[PDB]
Amino acid sequence: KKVIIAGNGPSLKEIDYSRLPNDFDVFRCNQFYFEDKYYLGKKCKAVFYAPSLFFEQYYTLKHLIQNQEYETELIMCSNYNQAHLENENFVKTFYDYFPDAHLGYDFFKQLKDFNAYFKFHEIYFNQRITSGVYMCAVAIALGYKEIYLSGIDFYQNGSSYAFDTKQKNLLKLAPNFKNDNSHYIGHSKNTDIKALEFLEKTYKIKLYCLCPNSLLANFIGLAPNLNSNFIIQEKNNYTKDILIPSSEAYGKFSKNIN
Amino acid sequence: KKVIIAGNGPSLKEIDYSRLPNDFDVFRCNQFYFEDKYYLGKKCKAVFYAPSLFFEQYYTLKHLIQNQEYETELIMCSNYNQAHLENENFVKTFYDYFPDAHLGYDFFKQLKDFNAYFKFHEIYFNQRITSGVYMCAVAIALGYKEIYLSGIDFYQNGSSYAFDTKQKNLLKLAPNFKNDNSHYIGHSKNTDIKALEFLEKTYKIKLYCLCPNSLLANFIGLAPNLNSNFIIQEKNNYTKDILIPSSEAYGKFSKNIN
Amino acid sequence: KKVIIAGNGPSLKEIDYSRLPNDFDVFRCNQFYFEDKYYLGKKCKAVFYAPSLFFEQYYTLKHLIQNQEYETELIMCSNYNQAHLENENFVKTFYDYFPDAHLGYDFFKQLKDFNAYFKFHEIYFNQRITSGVYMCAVAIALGYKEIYLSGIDFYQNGSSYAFDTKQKNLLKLAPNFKNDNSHYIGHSKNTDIKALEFLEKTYKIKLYCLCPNSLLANFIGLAPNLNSNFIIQEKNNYTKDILIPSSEAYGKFSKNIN
């Protein structure tokens, strides 16, 4: 199958749907569910969460599924086996706390050349790919060959996500969202582009751009027009903030955070 | 073979023996040996002990076997790979301290969907299945297809086991037994029933109820009447309290408790 | 092949050599090299050392081999995977510090029933088999079927080894040798005999006794008279004390002792 990999940049709201492939899987990450409409449908092949709020995102995802807001086959933690990026015990006990999820690194590390590329840039130059690029790597390891990108906009003029992230619960869990620039300073356009180009060339897969007005389109060729249809389903009374587990839950998980 | 899984609720003493299957294995757990009569015979396929008193139960079981009070093929520790439920070193060194026993989780974790079901409810909602339900999961992983339940009564009106648990040694090892309600507050009827229903539906096995007067019978269909016979053998001068290992034994095991 | 397993009791010096099998391997343990004559030849199939002085015994063995006093194919550490019996890091890094040796437990644990037998008696009853019995278990795991025993005398009237153990270096490394009873209080005749009987019956091997005047002969049938010959080669200017590694060597090994 073809895969659609979606960041949460503004271009998530400016997909050119006439270019949407006929039969695809969808990869979403992080606060994707803050979206005000189902820009890519409610069915996900995989959802990816950073290690830092994985405990609360997993909880929240279960509520989303129970609520029939989204479905997903795979749940991925976007880890790297780096002490500075993730809690060591969290990773060691992962499959025992989250038996229906995966460590994304199980797949990422299958791309040796890209693992090496990432680590060198991260460790020595503080140049860190974003989640969207990480999902691409995992897609490639899973055997996907045609990758359609959207919602990747390189944090222009602030973090500027495709939705309002200033929500009480997320702000309390992750105070970095209080300010306009909440993402890692080590991210950049060039870093993401160079990484994507490395992946395409190294693993001989194909990248397409679904959003013609995104800066991404200056670097990645457009998905072909197919005259596809898409009705964007609206959302109302939806989950638009992360949920906070009880203090008893935190206590049971306390060896696995910080 | 068919398996009979026995909790230690009052219904252990009100089995409808005309419904006992012809050829079965028996699973017992915890203080099963406190029973005043051999309500299910002295031959067990497996005995299951919680991690918390495993050290003393193993010792006690060896005495029971040496004494010809019970026989058993398998000895299981009912663990979950959760730091809040069990001592980490205990689990790591288990097969070296108890070479003829098993960690039950070796089998429980083979039921991925149920492992995930359990962990989510336990961690986030403090809803904990009971040992009887854990034995069912292990039975399923071992390949059993027809499961006959008894002694499961959901702790109605106190812990109310089928025997007197207020015994000197057990009270000293586990002071929680001093009070009428000694079991985990996180247990409940709904939690056990929902879990059992999940297992039956997910793994396409069959559950039966051996005790028509138990509340369990409101939820699980009765084992068919077969006109089976059973003479309940009495017990006298039997082991009705847990045994306490020497202080030298505790010293050797001290890295594996608390 | 048949194997001769030798403790270091007084009966080591009263082997009835007319009963020595025609083609055998020899297992020796601990301070075997303190012997004043080659009671079993200088060629060993295996030598076994307790964990406690393994570091110095390995060093000493290399000197014995370099000196052409003994040869051996296998070097075994007689471990049990018990924190109270052996240093944990020592066991974890063993093959990296001693690449041509083995942990005996790699073989001992292949005898599940006997592993369980040992652990239960050791942990709960403080009944500890001796090295001679441990070598028997390892012999069985290695596939030996006929086991000829000597030098097993149950520490009658003191530790009373077949040689003088009051040597400067051994006394400094292991002050317990200063007193007449230097062995573990948890050893006994009954414990060794019961264990040997368990092994013979459980693994359907054959035990023989090479020393007709040893108390062992009250329990184990005599090796058949074959009219075999044996000239006991004398030893002179031989290594009769353990060697002590340099303080630099101890420093490098310091994580692996105590």
Added chain:
Amino acid sequence: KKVIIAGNGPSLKEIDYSRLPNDFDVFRCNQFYFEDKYYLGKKCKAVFYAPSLFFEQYYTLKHLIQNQEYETELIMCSNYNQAHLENENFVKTFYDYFPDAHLGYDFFKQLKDFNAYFKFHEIYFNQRITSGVYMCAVAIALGYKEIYLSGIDFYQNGSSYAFDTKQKNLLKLAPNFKNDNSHYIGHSKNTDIKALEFLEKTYKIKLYCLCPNSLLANFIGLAPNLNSNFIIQEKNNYTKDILIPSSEAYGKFSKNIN
């Protein structure tokens, strides 16, 4: 293929090139890149770095490759699984920090007899083979059969490398280079020679000497004259000091040093 293994002794500059084999791979180690000319070409099959400065050497190597000063297929850390020789966490997380490199011990330990030989001499006698000998062992494990040695001179009259090692960055990272004798006191000619002889005899490979005026030639037969040609390419504006990673990089790696 045949392999050329190069230490960084003065004889690196006195190779008899008429003896250079026709088709070979090249192994270099440590500060090899300090060389003022390409005494063995810019193409390496493998480069080996000691654990102590591996973090900075890896960084530096990437710059050398980016700069087209050298190429290499394999990057090896010359480790031994010894706490006194290398940082434990460094070794445990190695493949996650350096995904395109190898722990040399993965290969060294495949030579059991030599692993045992090394450990015994190192631990008990403080007799430590040099990197050149370590590369030979790894070459043998990789399947090389004909080994041509150069740049091995046993540190005569000081460490006396084939280049100036008194460089600001190396001196700051490794103050031992400030003095004329900066190498391990535990190295010696006899130790290296005995080890090389052990390897040749044990693994039935062939050693040759490329440098007729080196003391090595008193012990190892000369590579046959083949009338081979070689033009030594000069180096200018080359990297002649190790590079120092940023303080942010050190912070991310801080669990893996000291």
